Ligand binder design. Structure first.
Ligand SMILES: O=C(O)[C@@H]1O[C@@H](O[C@H]2[C@H](O)[C@@H](NS(=O)(=O)O)[C@@H](O)O[C@@H]2COS(=O)(=O)O)[C@H](OS(=O)(=O)O)[C@@H](O)[C@@H]1O[C@H]1O[C@H](COS(=O)(=O)O)[C@@H](O)[C@H](O)[C@H]1NS(=O)(=O)O
Ligand SMILES: O=C(O)[C@@H]1O[C@@H](O[C@H]2[C@H](O)[C@@H](NS(=O)(=O)O)[C@@H](O)O[C@@H]2COS(=O)(=O)O)[C@H](OS(=O)(=O)O)[C@@H](O)[C@@H]1O[C@H]1O[C@H](COS(=O)(=O)O)[C@@H](O)[C@H](O)[C@H]1NS(=O)(=O)O
Lengths: 191, 49, 221, 207, 221, 191, 49
């Protein structure tokens, strides 16, 4: 098929053009809500930690995919391996509140704590990139977070996006290829 | 949903398990699905098969 | 008495992709409305179908240049989501997170020359089974191919068919692979008239039955 | 004939080499009367007209990847500009027209796109700019590109003095080619009009 | 056999705000009747709406004094539940236990002068976007404002509207904030006739759509 | 709106007065029963402890709110971390009864003991302040309690008000403000 | 209720889980709700809009 390409109108040809038969597709694994729904780890940690999905690694399946969207929304689940008790506080809270027990506080139970937390930002949607001239009264507004946690020590933090919604796609890149033809690597095979 | 495969109904109420969405006016506001389905599939011009 | 129960060994551990949900601790939160927010996408393949991105040729250009000499092969590349030429496409960006694929991949060719520049091209799918791809339109004619010329419509689209032994093919390529398992695509220039230095942009998009299965997290972290 | 005449307020623009209009992300605006402005917002129709801006000179030496950007809103000395100094909050979309006139004997191709929340792109990311609302300009086919986009952002209303949601980008996809019969270079201009202009929060005078 | 069960890791711990109940140990206790006990309240915002409390001005007074000189700004304060002027109100007392708010805040002005004391006032909401609030009724006129005079009715009520970028605003103020994020309220005195040393009491209450969400325990203990 | 303020009749104006639109409010978080329904800690402890909600901290969310009411009523839940066994006894019992096992006694089970207890005072309602000339046959009647607990050692005590009812509101104060304009503090923000 | 979000009915009877209220005569004895709803909202006097 030939078309006026300058218009940018989508064109999808099929093998029928030269005698083939287009087949059946099952696209469950490329479903946004499904694919974002798995735990991902946050590497940097500290006794006091503000939950920010952008601390996710840029090349991990979740972090790559999240960054391939401009705006997003989701609820959250967290797994925290910590010493002592864990206190969570919602978006907008004074850092000092983290010391108070009446905020959701999970008492230590081995081996870690799994929790379901609601979206809690004052915005209708959040962004992975924000073109602010400043945004004050490569930096993101401080209001873009899912609250904060505190314990005597935070050893590990996994985070899971629930009911994820993604808007306005952005570039997603594969590994840079050096070889003359294909990027080759060791694929699993029996001994 | 997406990646939840439990048969049994949840022990906790929905207003606890999740944040509650509000509206001003989940519908078919799927821009990219529309965009993709609108793609031209024919053949511009005359055919000789 | 009370209900007896057998706490089973081998069950109960956290699996990062498990199908359960956590217990809530902070209830009754209502979100600001986001009714009808624009630009939403629910499946990666909808955008992969609607938005073709560019292939990479020669010294890092999204196009191929018409040859002034008597060589007619403009480009040759592996039908692989891991191919160097596909390395900057959105299609390969998504594909790296899946172990297998199947289906149609579409190529788009947009001529960029002036009104007084004319040419005739040919694209062929060389299936596996031959040692090296042909550098001649005459040899490649025996394969599935399409020829088109220049005119009022600047773009031409062609479907690379999925023809393989197994029902699915790997998105990644093993180090022990000499020849590309799924074959090649060859773009030729039959002729041209005053089209020296004129360009042919080439991009790719997912076809109607393109499919990706088996999520994977392979990048070094 | 591919004739299109666009009208915004008391200003009109017509091309005879139209390749259509590209709508990005949506065909309409979301609700302009949300809870964040109580019921105090108003539409100001007098700001909905075309203003002009020079972009760059498309020359033979500018290679693939060369890119010019224009963050919106930009400096404005008409009623729209006054609105920005007179109200605390605003929202509007954009009706964008970009012209690159040379002649039919030139070659090459420009990609004109509208990007939400700009970030300086790698040269590798430049291969996927078509993921954003766009259109192309190739001398053999057209001289005008036209894109229409709605207002968007984490906030239903904005403070343009602190944030610019949209940014127009024109990138060289294939270098300009010239000959004896062609135009030696092509100047690229933008004809922009803000759409559905709404303001809220009257500011005090400077006195 | 018996029912198999998987005791799940990461579940079971006590969370101080959990949605479960404990097991009882001492049953059948009937309470003395408290049918129709007076003064009950079920929502903090009902009392915050019905009972306005006083703002704090100058050296610790619930009122503003009419200026004898040619300066017309009687008071200026941050539209913030954490403002010094709101620090003694019941509204701020409740607000400190929540992270976000939205909605209308009402101001009440009660003139206290003698029958032979007259005056004309003006209140304006200065939204954010200007560096400093205007100290002149003429400059503030361009904002949302109301003017009223003295007479048989001693009180005047005005609604500070919620106008912001986001749907919710923080009740607390960050140390990095120079200018108040939600703007200011300015009270002016257009003129007066023999009203020197006469007072204008000002109080605040929650409006019909005032809302507080996200409970928090922030005070030092 | 102008009114006769001396009457003290409630007046609630709206933005409609000058052309605005009053919006929708959702007041679940300011619901009394909901807000008082969370665990709060009691700092002073001892092997023998009489449960008195006034031992709650005056600035904590529960303690602040409770003190902002004159009379109240509620059932209770307690979490106790203790050595040995825990015995509870209802309001009005001889302190000596605490040593007897036939009173509700919870045998030690790690990590602590959670229990549901009923209101047990001889009054229809209790008070946070009591204007007694004496009240005998800044002090509250001894009958104002929820019983008492005893163990070899009591390390921690959390208390939770169930089915709370509050009557006749009292002053509730925010932090005293020193600054010229606002009380500013460090609000959580991502790193 | 208030801050209980479990779907499943309680295993223990109500007379064990809680103290039992008695009456002499939960009704609408909400003074402050009445007080707030009774608030004047109009505009005293004549209007010129
Ligand atoms: O070494 C290369 O591959 C050179 O890389 C390309 O530049 C990358 C850049 O490295 C990358 N930054 S990052 O830190 O690596 O992430 C990012 O900025 O993208 C650009 C573009 O990469 S792309 O995948 O090609 O799109 C050079 O492109 S550019 O600098 O013009 O933008 C690319 O031309 C380079 O490749 C050349 O060198 C390769 C190996 O170098 S060497 O022999 O060891 O000296 C060689 O294998 C390539 O064939 C050659 N490219 S050629 O086609 O012009 O011959
Ligand atoms: O230092 C102050 O802020 C002075 O405090 C106020 O007194 C408080 C009193 O401190 C407080 N007791 S407590 O132990 O702190 O809890 C309680 O009794 O309330 C009163 C009233 O406080 S209120 O918030 O103002 O309502 C003084 O008021 S009063 O004593 O007349 O009742 C208040 O006037 C004082 O503030 C003045 O001093 C401030 C700092 O002091 S210094 O410069 O270091 O010496 C200064 O910042 C204030 O501006 C000033 N008040 S002014 O408006 O008269 O100038």
């Amino acid at each position: 098929t030939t078309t006026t390409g300058e218009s940018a109108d989508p064109v999808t040809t099929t093998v029928e053009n030269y005698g083939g038969d287009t087949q059946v597709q099952r696209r469950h694994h490329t479903d946004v809500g499904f694919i974002m729904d798995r735990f991902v780890k946050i590497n940097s940690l500290s006794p006091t930690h503000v939950i920010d999905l952008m601390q996710t690694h840029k090349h991990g399946i979740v972090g790559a995919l999240l960054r391939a969207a401009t705006y997003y929304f989701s609820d959250l689940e967290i797994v925290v391996r910590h010493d002592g008790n864990l206190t969570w506080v919602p978006n907008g809270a004074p850092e000092a509140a983290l010391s108070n027990t009446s905020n959701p506080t999970a008492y230590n139970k081995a081996p870690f704590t799994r929790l379901a937390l609601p979206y809690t930002a004052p915005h209708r949607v959040l962004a992975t990139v924000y073109d602010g001239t400043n945004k004050y009264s490569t930096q993101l507004p401080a209001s873009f977070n899912y609250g904060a946690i505190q314990a005597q020590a935070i050893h590990e933090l996994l985070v899971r996006m629930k009911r994820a919604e993604l808007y306005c796609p952005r570039p997603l890149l594969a590994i840079k290829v050096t070889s003359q033809d294909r990027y080759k690597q060791k694929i699993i095979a029996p001994a | 949903s997406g990646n939840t495969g439990s048969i049994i109904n949840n022990y906790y109420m929905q207003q606890y398990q999740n944040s509650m969405s509000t509206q001003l006016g989940t519908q078919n506001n799927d821009w990219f699905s529309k965009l993709a389905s609108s793609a031209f599939t024919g053949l511009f011009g005359a055919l000789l098969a | 008495g009370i209900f007896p129960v057998a706490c089973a060994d081998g069950y109960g551990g956290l699996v990062t992709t498990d199908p359960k949900t956590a217990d809530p601790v902070y209830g009754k939160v209502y979100n600001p409305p986001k009714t009808n927010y624009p630009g939403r996408f629910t499946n990666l393949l909808d955008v992969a179908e609607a938005c073709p991105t560019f292939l990479r040729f020669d010294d890092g250009k999204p196009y191929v240049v018409t040859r002034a000499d008597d060589t007619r092969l403009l480009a040759k590349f592996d039908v692989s989501l891991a191919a160097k030429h596909m390395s900057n496409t959105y299609l390969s960006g998504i594909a790296q997170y899946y172990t297998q694929y199947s289906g149609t991949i579409n190529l788009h060719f947009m001529f960029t020359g002036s009104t007084d520049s004319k040419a005739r091209y040919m694209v062929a799918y060389i299936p596996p089974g031959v040692e090296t791809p042909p550098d001649t339109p005459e040899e490649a004619a025996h394969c599935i191919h399409a020829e088109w010329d220049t005119g009022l419509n600047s773009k031409f689209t062609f479907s690379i068919p999925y023809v393989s032994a197994a029902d699915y093919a790997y998105t990644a390529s093993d180090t022990a692979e000499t020849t590309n398992v799924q074959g090649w695509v060859c773009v030729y220039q039959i002729t041209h008239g005053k089209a020296e230095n004129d360009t042919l942009l080439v991009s790719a998009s997912a076809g109607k039955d393109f499919e990706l299965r088996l999520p994977i997290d392979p990048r070094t972290q | 004939d591919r004739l299109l005449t666009t009208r915004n307020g008391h200003t009109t623009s017509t091309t005879q080499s139209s390749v259509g209009v590209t709508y990005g992300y949506s065909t309409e605006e979301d609700h302009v009367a949300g809870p964040n402005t109580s019921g105090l917002e108003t539409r100001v129709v007098q700001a909905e007209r075309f203003f002009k801006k020079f972009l760059f000179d498309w020359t033979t030496d500018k290679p693939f990847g060369y890119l010019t950007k224009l963050e919106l809103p930009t400096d404005h000395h008409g009623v729209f500009g006054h609105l920005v100094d007179s109200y605390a909050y605003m929202r509007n979309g954009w009706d964008v027209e970009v012209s690159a006139v040379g002649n039919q004997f030139n070659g090459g191709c420009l990609l004109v796109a509208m990007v939400p929340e700009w970030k300086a792109f790698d040269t590798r990311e430049k291969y996927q700019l078509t993921l954003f609302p766009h259109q192309f300009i190739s001398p053999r086919t057209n001289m005008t590109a036209h894109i229409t986009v709605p207002y968007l952002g984490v906030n239903r209303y904005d403070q343009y003095k602190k944030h610019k949601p949209w940014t127009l980008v024109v990138m060289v996809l294939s270098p300009l080619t010239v000959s004896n019969t062609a135009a030696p270079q092509i100047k690229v201009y933008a004809n922009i009009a803000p759409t559905y202009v709404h303001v809220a929060g009257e500011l005090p005078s400077k006195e």
